[PDB]
């Protein structure tokens, strides 16, 4: 469902 | 459902 | 659903 | 952001 | 954003 | 950000 | 789908 | 499916 | 699925 | 007295 | 009084 | 009095 | 929101 | 938003 | 919210 | 009712 | 009822 | 009843 | 001085 | 000074 | 001074 | 808000 | 709002 | 609030 | 009553 | 009174 | 009253 | 500089 | 530099 | 460099 | 403000 | 502020 | 602020 | 360089 | 290089 | 070099 | 507010 | 404000 | 506030 | 990149 | 990247 | 990569 | 006095 | 003074 | 004085 990427 | 890049 | 790019 | 209601 | 309501 | 309700 | 009632 | 009721 | 209901 | 849906 | 559906 | 749904 | 007064 | 007084 | 002063 | 008195 | 003097 | 007097 | 109702 | 009421 | 309700 | 300076 | 200097 | 200064 | 000087 | 001075 | 000065 | 009444 | 009063 | 009064 | 993607 | 992305 | 991805 | 492909 | 399937 | 894949 | 460079 | 550079 | 540099 | 003065 | 100076 | 100065 | 280069 | 280079 | 270099 959730994917951060920095 | 979230993908975020920075 | 979200893809984002800075 | 995202809301889903069903 | 986006929001969905079915 | 996610909500959700079945 | 919704049903709201009152 | 959703029902509310007052 | 869900009732509210007073 | 106050019903919001989203 | 309140009912919030998110 | 108070009820909320997320 | 809601305030009353009687 | 509702705001009563009587 | 909800504030009552009677 | 309400009733403010100076 | 509400009084208020001064 | 409220009665504020000073 | 400061007197407010709602 | 102040008299505030809700 | 200072007088508040709520 | 009050403010005074005498 | 009130400012006062005398 | 108030603030005094004599 | 108020005097600045400079 | 207030008296300033530089 | 109030003195200030430098 | 900086002098400021209120 | 700074003098504030209130 | 820094004075402030209330 | 800068911003880069390459 | 800067943001790079390669 | 600075940030990278590569 | 970038790529995205869905 | 980046690369995001789906 | 970054591959995501679902 | 100040700020100084020299 | 002030603001000063020299 | 202040902020110097020589 | 960035130089800010002031 | 950064120099800030105030 | 990062510097400032105040 | 100021003086940059780069 | 000030000098910055790079 | 202040000197930066890199």
């Known amino acids: ?3 951060i990427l920095k």
Do not use: F, L
């Open 1 to 3: 469902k959730i994917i």
